[PDB]
Amino acid sequence: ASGALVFYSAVDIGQDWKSALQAAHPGLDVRIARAGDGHVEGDPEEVRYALVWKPPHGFFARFPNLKLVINLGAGVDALVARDDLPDVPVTRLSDPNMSQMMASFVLFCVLRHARDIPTFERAQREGRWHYVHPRTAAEIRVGVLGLGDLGAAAALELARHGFDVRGWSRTPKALEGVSCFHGLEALPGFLAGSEIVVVMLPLTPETRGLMNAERLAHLPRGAKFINVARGPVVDEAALIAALRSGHIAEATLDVFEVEPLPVGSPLWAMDNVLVTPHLASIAIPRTAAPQIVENIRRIEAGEPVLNQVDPRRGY
Amino acid sequence: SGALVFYSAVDIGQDWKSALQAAHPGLDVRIARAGDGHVEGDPEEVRYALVWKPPHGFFARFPNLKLVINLGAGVDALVARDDLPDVPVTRLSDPNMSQMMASFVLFCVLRHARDIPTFERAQREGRWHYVHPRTAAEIRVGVLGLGDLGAAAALELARHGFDVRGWSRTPKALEGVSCFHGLEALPGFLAGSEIVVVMLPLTPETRGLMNAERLAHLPRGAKFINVARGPVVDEAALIAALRSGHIAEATLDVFEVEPLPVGSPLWAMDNVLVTPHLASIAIPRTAAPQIVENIRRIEAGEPVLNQVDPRRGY
Ligand SMILES: NC(=O)C1=CN([C@@H]2O[C@H](COP(=O)(O)OP(=O)(O)OC[C@H]3O[C@@H](n4cnc5c(N)ncnc54)[C@H](OP(=O)(O)O)[C@@H]3O)[C@@H](O)[C@H]2O)C=CC1
Numbered sequence: 133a134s135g136a137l138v139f140y141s142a143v144d145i146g147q148d149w150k151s152a153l154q155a156a157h158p159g160l161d162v163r164i165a166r167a168g169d170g171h172v173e174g175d176p177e178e179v180r181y182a183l184v185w186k187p188p189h190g191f192f193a194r195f196p197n198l199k200l201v202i203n204l205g206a207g208v209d210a211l212v213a214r215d216d217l218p219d220v221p222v223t224r225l226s227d228p229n230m231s232q233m234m235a236s237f238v239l240f241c242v243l244r245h246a247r248d249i250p251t252f253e254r255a256q257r258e259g260r261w262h263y264v265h266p267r268t269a270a271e272i273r274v275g276v277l278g279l280g281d282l283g284a285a286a287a288l289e290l291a292r293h294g295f296d297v298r299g300w301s302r303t304p305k306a307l308e309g310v311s312c313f314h315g316l317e318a319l320p321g322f323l324a325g326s327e328i329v330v331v332m333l334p335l336t337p338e339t340r341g342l343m344n345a346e347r348l349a350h351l352p353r354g355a356k357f358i359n360v361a362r363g364p365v366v367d368e369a370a371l372i373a374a375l376r377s378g379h380i381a382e383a384t385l386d387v388f389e390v391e392p393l394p395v396g397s398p399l400w401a402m403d404n405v406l407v408t409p410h411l412a413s414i415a416i417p418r419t420a421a422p423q424i425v426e427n428i429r430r431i432e433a434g435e436p437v438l439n440q441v442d443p444r445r446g447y
Numbered sequence: 448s449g450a451l452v453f454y455s456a457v458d459i460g461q462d463w464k465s466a467l468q469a470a471h472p473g474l475d476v477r478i479a480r481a482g483d484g485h486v487e488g489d490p491e492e493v494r495y496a497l498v499w500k501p502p503h504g505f506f507a508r509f510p511n512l513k514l515v516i517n518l519g520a521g522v523d524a525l526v527a528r529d530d531l532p533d534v535p536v537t538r539l540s541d542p543n544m545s546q547m548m549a550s551f552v553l554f555c556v557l558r559h560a561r562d563i564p565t566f567e568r569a570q571r572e573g574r575w576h577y578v579h580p581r582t583a584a585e586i587r588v589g590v591l592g593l594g595d596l597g598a599a600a601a602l603e604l605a606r607h608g609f610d611v612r613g614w615s616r617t618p619k620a621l622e623g624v625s626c627f628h629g630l631e632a633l634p635g636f637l638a639g640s641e642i643v644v645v646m647l648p649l650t651p652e653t654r655g656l657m658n659a660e661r662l663a664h665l666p667r668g669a670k671f672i673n674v675a676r677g678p679v680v681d682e683a684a685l686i687a688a689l690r691s692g693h694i695a696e697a698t699l700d701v702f703e704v705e706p707l708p709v710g711s712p713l714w715a716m717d718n719v720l721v722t723p724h725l726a727s728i729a730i731p732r733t734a735a736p737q738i739v740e741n742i743r744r745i746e747a748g749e750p751v752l753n754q755v756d757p758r759r760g761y
Pocket residue numbers: 206207208226234277278279280281282283284300301302303304315332333334335336338339360361362386387410411412413414447
């Protein structure tokens with residue numbers, strides 16, 4: 133006995149999401165809220181599901197019969213910090229296609245550093261052919277901070293390519309072919325062995341500024357630093373200082389403390405830093421829709437929903 | 448077992464010697480002198496030769512040679528020699544080398560597929576510009592050559608969700624890859640390849656295969672990767688196709704003349720990535736086992752692994 137789904141995003145095409153959802157669930161009542169103020173036509177009491185990205189303040193209070201919130205990203209740090217969040221299950225998008233895209237992107241980042249590509253790019257700009265003897269993957273230790281839906285998938289993929297892979301999480305995890313560390317006490321040792329490090333942590337009060345000057349100093353000199361998580365997990369000023377002193381040799385950064393990265397940032401002009409504009413992975417309507425309609429079915433049947441977030445923890 | 452002679456001006460003989468002796472205790476390994484190939488000891492005891500571009504007449508020093516092993520996966524220079532002895536000729540081709548090449552090809556493809564050169568151009572201008580990412584399933588990737596390296600790369604590309612196709616001389620079946628074969632099918636193979644990866648050996652048939660005409664069969668805006676041999680591509684024709692925008696971007700590990708001459712237009716192109724011929728390499732420790740296994744086989748009268756056809760050139 134399905135109710136209506138309301139959609140809000142200023143940065144996603146409502147019609148694409150609507151078409152995909154209706155293909156997965158014929159006859160689903162989908163209402164596209166208006167960008168900016170969230171105004172939506174129809175009876176708001178019929179709305180039971182909300183698929184959103186950064187909706188206006190008070191948006192959820194429009195819909196008193198809301199049974200389910202779905203964030204349009206894998207991250208929920210802004211959503212869970214809201215004062216108007218209703219006391220219902222909160223879910224995020226986290227499908228195998230998103231997983232694959234993120235894992236492939238992380239692999240690209242790691243391989244790019246592992247195969248000395250920034251050295252060749254620097255040399256190419258000078259018109260210089262200079263052979264550098266390649267290293268095998270087995271020689272290189274790669275650490276993944278976070279072993280969740282995305283982090284574990286990336287770690288497992290890195291392991292397939294022959295890297296000596298390690299992972300860090302909050303609680304114990306077993307992951308075949310990956311050296312698993314857990315807890316804050318183990319973090320220095322985890323970092324000490326990570327020649328290449330990949331940040332795949334959600335942003336929470338515990339992770340905010342985790343990679344500060346002290347944590348960066350635990351990485352071995354010449355480490356390669358990749359952030360595909362959230363910018364404020366890293367103390368950006370401290371990363372810059374560590375890049376400038378040569379403690380961090382190179383970095384690939386998809387996320388930043390302030391996005392877009394301000395024009396004045398020293399990171400722009402550094403030829404040992406690769407800046408991507410926060411697009412490591414995204415949900416695609418056609419492949420994201422099935423899990424959404426499955427959660428609609430579950431909420432109406434009284435079954436527990438997939439990909440539920442803990443609003444207190446923030447992931 | 449007889450003695451193995453080693454020749455290379457660009458590989459450390461001691462590392463190869465140590466690895467071979469670990470895999471085959473007591474193996475008589477003789478390091479020939481760089482430049483002229485002079486070696487101490489009785490040359491009649493030498494039965495195996497592990498070489499990279501040895502001097503002219505090098506093999507004629509060793510009349511009891513039973514086996515040649517090239518220190519690369521490619522053998523185009525070796526098989527063109529007038530002094531090559533009529534014995535089995537093998538190349539290095541181990542699963543570690545395979546993995547390294549496959550990972551490198553994956554890096555190249557992902558770099559193009561995820562629009563990285565666009566972000567690098569933008570970064571150099573201090574400009575933040577979002578470009579909506581494409582799923583791997585939307586992107587067709589073609590691999591020219593489906594051998595030890597080519598098939599491994601194609602299979603890896605398929606794991607990442609790309610619509611992968613492959614081209615070879617004779618029919619091949621490769622799970623999850625659209626296989627084309629023969630010269631008649633090449634235009635159609637290329638026409639569907641948004642990203643193309645050259646993984647062909649250099650032979651008279653493949654030399655200049657990717658000429659102006661073949662490049663024109665690729666769709667406009669194609670991304671072009673060469674990790675094979677430079678002369679498979681008509682370099683001047685590639686440059687012209689880059690300049691006209693028919694080829695959007697390229698990643699080139701190999702060139703007609705290596706090192707790439709300083710005057711080449713390719714150096715200064717921000718849509719071209721130049722790497723200095725190092726896509727994949729043999730590592731002594733993991734390459735040695737197959738070499739000592741072929742020594743065992745040649746002495747037992749068993750057929751050798753990774754034999755090349757000197758007439759065909761691979
Ligand atoms: N750049 C981009 O475009 C994108 C970025 N992201 C970001 O990636 C993040 C990761 O996604 P995903 O893997 O699915 O997240 P998950 O919620 O599935 O997993 C989070 C992981 O982080 C660990 N973790 C959380 N807090 C701590 C802590 N204080 N100390 C140690 N480990 C901690 C968890 O450990 P445990 O389970 O034991 O608690 C778990 O291993 C998202 O939250 C989002 O911020 C996601 C998609 C795209």
